[PDB]
Design a binder for these strands. Structure first.
Ligand SMILES: [Mg+2]
Ligand SMILES: [Mg+2]
Ligand SMILES: [Mg+2]
Ligand SMILES: [Mg+2]
Ligand SMILES: [Mg+2]
Ligand SMILES: [Mg+2]
Ligand SMILES: [Mg+2]
Ligand SMILES: [Mg+2]
Ligand SMILES: [Mg+2]
Ligand SMILES: [Mg+2]
Ligand SMILES: [Mg+2]
Ligand SMILES: [Mg+2]
Ligand SMILES: [Mg+2]
Lengths: 96, 287, 140, 103, 190, 100, 275
RNA sequence: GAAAUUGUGGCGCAAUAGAUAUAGUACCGCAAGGGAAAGAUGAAAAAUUAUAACCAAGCAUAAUAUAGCAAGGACUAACCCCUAUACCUUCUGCAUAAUGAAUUAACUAGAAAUAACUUUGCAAGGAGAGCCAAAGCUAAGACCCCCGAAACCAGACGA
């Protein structure tokens, strides 16, 4: 019986956390900051996709180029395999 | 506004209010349910439903339409074709009217670019502007123009108005520099000497009947006269009018820019222009 | 798993509610229940048409029964009533037969009379008075 | 279906049509929220169309609780003892009014 | 959405450990045909169409559009009586309580956005007051933005900040094509 | 404090007097404020007197003194919603309650 | 451990419902349940029936002696009904007598009395009260309200009404409410008796100065164990009534009953009665 | 398929998920190698307390009564009357005596842009360089599955 008896502990959420209070502050820095910095330089993330939208396969490719050199053998291989698969799936398998 | 007034009523516009305009966001058709599940838009067995359908163009083993036709040089040497973005006289006139592009100064490519009449792009092998006949009549400029090709009619039009059409040549590299000079400056190299016509453009720019910058200026007046004879109207003598001093300036070649020599290094921050000295370097620049 | 169904029990229960009173696993096991419940639903929808037919047949049977007690057949009766312009529906006629027998008897008599009149008319091809319980009220 | 559902016969409580038609509705209990889109329609009804309704039928005695309710309900209590309890959740004002009338 | 880089990953049937071997032969056994233990149908097999990779959701709205949005937001704030201009930000005390009291008196709101330019020319007192107050937030005008405005029940701008805004936001109107990026100098632009 | 405001009870004359004090001629209602300083003087003074500040959403609207007068003449009442409900001639069927 | 909340809540609700179904509470009086204003409800009640009356005077018609006693006890730790209730009972009875007499004069006095009793007895009246929502507004010691108490309350209400508007109005009300509980109900259900034959004989004597013979009209079965004896009742070679039965005695009894009904202006036919 | 040239967290999982992992253990394998499962009290077990229960299938409490896809129309009545050829798939066509499915539980399958359409933005221009532009251009939104061989080859391990 997947459904349960004890209803959960109350999910407390401060909507005025230091994160949420200042979410989006400085974001939009170009159009009112003499274009010193692009908003794409605000974002913090994995280097291979920083201000770059991409696609599944494309992302993989980017990762392989940007980072692959300094990537863990067990994971690099996996990445390569993924790329191989992904190309096949896109360039051949689907509809239209 | 009425809308603003209305907004005095209604609640404060919060994140809990907001909604995208109808039509902007389409519903997402995903395949769970009796309408969109079961065969799920794929059909029945075969090579459709399994994916695996053969490539685009293939015609089931009949020779493909694209392969059945014979080859032919339509796009044979297209990356080695010179491509000239056209500027119609009408456009030029409009620009003049609007204030951007000042006819009291010379009209070089750079000026035009700044104005944003003619956008051009060295990648995709543009070799500059070509002056075109489109606003032949209904034109009134009286201006000198450095332009990379010119129709005869266009030339005539300008001349009748008391202007000076001079054609000029910008190598792809030179052209790039011309188009956006500030980025070149930022890059930090010395302003290079532009190269000459390659081989088959040399006979163009050495003739005075298309106002070539290497053509002998003794024949220019003759050419002008000839033009006048053909298309009616009288040549306005240039020497008498007040702007002659500016109309005489001719961008003496391997210079790129109208004031700056080849070999100048333009320091933008802390505004100076560094010049080369050193005899050999100077000689090279001259060459 | 990102998002998996918390509310599935309820869906199961929705169908099992309708299956409670079936025999055997049909009322316990959701898979079997669903098929049965749907079938039941289908039957119910179909049954509406059947019900109406059945009722009318029952009424006809009752009226026939009543009519035979007065020496008349159903069809004769109905036809004569139609001729008379007495347009009582068969539910109502059945009710009459059950609950208000003298009225039913009277109706039967009337029908018989009408029939007789018709018969009479048939002998003499045309004319004269058409008979008293014959004729028709003309609306204009 | 009819086999599943419990059945009933037609009747009228305490012979209403004979003597006097008696309003069988005793009480409408309106659980509403002060804040919450759940009960905007309900709020509107309370503001404008409830008083009029009350005036129209004085045998009914309306209650309105305003009880920070996440889902608003209107509890209709009848003369026999039965309690028809129905939701007002994100309904338009007109619809709500209609529902009330039906009750 | 433009910053959002979702970090959710799962293992495809390739990336899960082992199971390249046929569990039992295809045709002999009376079981379901299978190729790999670790196929999606199996317990602790690979995920079919799971989330995979850090996914970036980045997209650039036209700068002009962004500007318009800001302008629109400002308009809304003024229209709705929630915008308040100040001669300056300057609290005599620099106490959190005091500010709150003032707000209450003036019927400002639950939360109050305070805006005054630079960051470096901030009044100390105001800084002191806001810092402890969760809701009463300070931003330089460079940081002012739509979402924040939406969040906060009031907008409180200085005159200089207003001026700055005017300067910036009207410049998206009556301008040229970029030609090249505005970080590079031009004649007019700073 | 209170948002509640009743329009006077004089007012029409008082406003005129104020105007005179600030800046007198014929057609006093038809005077355009236009000059900013004058506007600041008048409106602020009125607010100080009446306890009724002109909204900055509505500030652009009143160009003339007539507009200002019109604005002043309409009432505002704080009340609270329960109170309002109570006021609004409740028949003996209704029993509204507030659980806060 | 799934990620939600709503589902859990729903489940909890369901569980609660189940519990309620299983072990329900000792049914509580409506005054204790939250939404409830006494005066307002009284007013509503007054409005509902379509005749106005004094609210101070009505309120007292609900207050019971037991309740008063309880209150006193509580205090230790009002007028009451009697004056009105008695009046209500008596006047109501009189009204009933008048109506019935007007309708069917061939009914005997005893029969009429019985009918009245049935109308105003512990059951029917109680039922009526329940239907009307008297039980809610009444306030007594203990719960559910015992039937006698309910009856008393009802009569007090009637008395109050009489005091307020007028006799005619009260009569009308009575007609509407109490008397409409003999609509389907034939005689003998209301005024139950033993040995109808004797009664018939007496009635016959009163009327014609004669005695009835009891002939047997029809019979299917008899030896079957499911007979249908259809037995008449003849007076000077003319049947006054005729009834059916499983046995002959039963049939005779039925016939007698039918005859009685015929005599006392009843039958199933009757006349609809004017409202 | 190039080059010049240009240039200290989480809208994550939370015990069939997340690592194969409470473990590379147990177990299987001559060996290389394969490779699991599962735990869940309370502040206190130096409180064994007593209640928290109520909820899958399966059972039990509770065997059965003519007749028939398990029901529906009903009916005062559970049956009795009348109506009624399970489902999915695969088929020209299936009650078929064609496939699949004992049942419950949880897990288990449409993912990609050109080109279109849409609604915003700006507009002879658009676009945060490069790209496109004889109304365009920028923007988002919206289409494109899962399971299954016999096989081939590389490198180990086994007489
Ligand atoms: Mg299916
Ligand atoms: Mg298929
Ligand atoms: Mg096929
Ligand atoms: Mg061939
Ligand atoms: Mg593998
Ligand atoms: Mg395989
Ligand atoms: Mg796994
Ligand atoms: Mg695990
Ligand atoms: Mg069970
Ligand atoms: Mg049968
Ligand atoms: Mg087969
Ligand atoms: Mg092969
Ligand atoms: Mg050996």
């Amino acid at each position: 019986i997947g459904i349960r008896l004890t209803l959960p502990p109350p999910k407390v959420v401060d909507r005025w956390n230091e994160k949420r209070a200042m979410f989006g502050v400085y974001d939009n820095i170009g159009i009112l900051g003499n274009f010193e910095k692009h908003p794409k330089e605000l974002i913090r993330g994995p280097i291979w996709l920083r201000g770059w939208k991409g696609n599944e396969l494309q992302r993989c490719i980017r990762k392989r180029k940007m980072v692959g050199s300094r990537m863990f053998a067990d994971d690099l291989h996996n990445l390569n395999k993924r790329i191989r698969y992904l190309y096949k799936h896109f360039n051949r398998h689907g509809k239209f | 506004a009425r809308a603003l007034d209305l907004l005095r009523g209604l609640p404060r516009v919060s994140l809990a209010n907001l909604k995208p305009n109808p039509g902007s966001k389409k519903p997402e058709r995903r395949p769970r349910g009796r309408r969109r599940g079961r065969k799920c838009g794929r059909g029945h067995k075969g090579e459709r439903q399994r994916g695996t359908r053969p490539r685009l163009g293939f015609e089931g083993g009949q020779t493909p339409f694209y392969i059945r036709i014979p080859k032919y040089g339509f796009n044979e040497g297209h990356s080695f074709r010179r491509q000239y973005k056209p500027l119609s006289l009408n456009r030029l006139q409009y620009l003049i009217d609007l204030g951007r592009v000042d006819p009291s100064q010379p009209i070089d490519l750079t000026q035009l670019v700044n104005g944003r009449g003619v956008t051009i792009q060295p990648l995709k092998r543009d070799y500059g502007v070509q002056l075109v006949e489109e606003g032949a009549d209904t034109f009134t400029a009286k201006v000198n123009i450095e332009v990379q090709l010119a129709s005869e009619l266009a030339i005539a039009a300008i001349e009748k108005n008391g202007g000076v059409v001079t054609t000029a040549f910008y190598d792809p590299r030179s052209l790039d520099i011309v188009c956006k000079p500030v980025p070149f400056f930022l890059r930090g190299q010395p302003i290079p000497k532009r190269m000459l016509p390659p081989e088959e453009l040399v006979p163009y720019y050495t003739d005075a009947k298309n106002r070539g910058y290497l053509a002998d200026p003794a024949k220019f007046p003759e050419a002008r006269l000839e033009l006048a004879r053909k298309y009616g109207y009288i040549l306005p003598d240039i020497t008498k009018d007040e702007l002659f001093k500016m109309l005489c300036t001719r961008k003496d070649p391997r210079q790129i820019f109208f004031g700056l020599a080849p070999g100048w290094v333009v320091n933008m921050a802390d505004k100076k222009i560094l010049k080369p000295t050193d005899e050999n370097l100077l000689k090279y620049y001259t060459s | 798993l990102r998002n998996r169904v918390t509310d599935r029990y309820f869906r199961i229960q929705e169908v099992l509610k309708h299956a409670r009173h079936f025999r055997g696993r049909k009322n316990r096991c959701y898979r079997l229940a669903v098929r049965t419940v749907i079938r039941a639903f289908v039957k119910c929808t179909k049954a509406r048409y059947l019900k109406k037919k059945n009722m009318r047949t029952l009424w006809i049977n009752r009226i026939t029964a009543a009519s035979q007690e007065h020496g008349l057949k159903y069809p004769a009766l109905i036809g004569n009533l139609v001729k008379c312009q007495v347009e009582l529906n068969r539910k109502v006629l059945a009710d009459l037969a059950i609950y208000e027998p003298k009225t039913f008897k009277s109706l039967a008599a009337l029908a018989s009379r009408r029939r007789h009149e018709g018969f009479a008319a048939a002998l003499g091809d045309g004319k004269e008075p058409e008979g008293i319980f014959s004729r028709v009220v003309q609306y204009h | 279906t009819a086999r599943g559902t419990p059945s009933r016969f037609l009747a009228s409580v305490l012979h209403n049509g004979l003597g006097r038609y008696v309003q069988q509705l005793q009480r409408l209990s309106f659980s509403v929220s002060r804040d919450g889109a759940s009960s905007r329609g309900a709020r509107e009804f309370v503001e404008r169309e409830v008083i009029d309704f009350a005036r129209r039928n004085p045998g009914v005695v309306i209650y309105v609780n305003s009880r920070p309710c996440c889902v608003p309900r209107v509890v209709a209590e009848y003369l026999n003892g039965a309690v028809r309890e129905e939701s007002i959740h994100c309904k338009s004002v007109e619809e709500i009014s209609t529902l009330v009338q039906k009750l | 959405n433009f910053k959002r880089i979702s970090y959710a990953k799962t293992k495809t049937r390739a990336e899960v450990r082992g199971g390249g071997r046929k569990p039992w032969p295809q045709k002999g056994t009376g079981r379901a045909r299978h190729g790999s233990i670790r196929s999606p149908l199996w317990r602790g097999g690979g995920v079919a169409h799971g989330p995979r990779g850090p996914t970036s959701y980045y997209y650039m709205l036209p700068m002009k559009v962004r500007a318009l949005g800001l302008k629109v937001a400002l308009t809304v704030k003024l229209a709705q009586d929630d915008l308040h201009i100040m001669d300056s930000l300057e609290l005599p005390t620099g106490d959190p309580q005091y500010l709150t009291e003032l707000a209450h008196y003036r019927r400002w709101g639950d939360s109050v956005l305070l805006v005054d330019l630079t960051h470096e020319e901030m009044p100390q007192s105001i800084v002191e007051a806001t810092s402890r107050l969760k809701t009463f937030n300070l931003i330089p005008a460079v940081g002012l933005n739509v979402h924040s405005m939406l969040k906060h029940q009031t907008l409180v701008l200085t005159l200089p900040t207003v001026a700055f805004l005017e300067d910036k936001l009207l410049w998206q109107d009556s301008r040229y094509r970029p030609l090249y990026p505005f970080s590079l100098p031009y004649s007019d632009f700073p | 404090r209170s948002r509640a405001y009743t329009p006077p009870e004089d007012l029409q004359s008082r406003l005129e007097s104020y105007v005179k004090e600030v800046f007198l001629p014929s057609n006093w209602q038809d005077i355009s404020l236009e000059d900013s300083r004058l506007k600041f003087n008048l409106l602020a003074h009125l607010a100080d007197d009446l306890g009724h500040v002109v909204p900055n959403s509505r500030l652009h609207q009143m160009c003339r003194v007539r507009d200002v007068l019109d604005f002043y003449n309409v009432p505002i009442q704080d009340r609270s919603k329960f109170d309002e409900l109570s006021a609004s001639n409740l028949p003996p069927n209704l029993k509204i309650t507030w659980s806060y | 451990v799934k990620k939600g909340f709503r589902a859990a809540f729903r489940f909890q609700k369901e569980l609660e419902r189940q519990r309620l179904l299983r072990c329900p509470p000792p049914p509580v009086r409506r005054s204790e349940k939250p939404n409830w204003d006494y005066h307002a409800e009284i007013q509503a009640f007054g409005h509902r029936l379509q005749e106005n009356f004094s609210l101070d005077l009505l309120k007292t018609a609900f207050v019971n002696s037991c309740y008063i006693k309880s209150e006193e006890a509580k205090r230790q730790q009002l007028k009451s009904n009697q004056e009105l209730s008695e009046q209500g009972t008596s006047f109501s009875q009189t009204c009933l007598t008048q109506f019935l007499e007007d309708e069917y004069p061939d009914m005997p006095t005893e029969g009429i009395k019985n009918l009245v009793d049935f109308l105003t007895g512990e059951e029917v009246v109680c039922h009526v009260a329940r239907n009307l929502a008297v039980e809610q507004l009444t306030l007594s010691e203990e719960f559910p309200v015992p039937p006698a108490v309910l009856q008393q309350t009802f009569f007090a209400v009637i008395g109050a009404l009489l005091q307020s508007s007028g006799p005619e109005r009260t009569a009308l009300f009575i007609r509407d409410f109490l008397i409409t509980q003999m609509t389907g109900k034939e005689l003998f259900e209301m005024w139950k008796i033993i040995n109808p034959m004797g009664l018939l004989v007496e009635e016959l004597k009163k009327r014609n100065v004669s005695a009835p013979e009891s002939r047997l009209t029809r019979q299917s079965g008899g030896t079957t164990a499911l007979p249908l004896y259809f037995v008449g009742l003849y007076c000077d070679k003319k049947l006054i009534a005729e009834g059916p039965g499983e046995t002959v005695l039963v049939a005779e009894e039925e016939a007698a009953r039918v005859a009685l009904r015929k005599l006392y202006g009843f039958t199933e036919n009757r006349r609809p009665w004017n409202y």
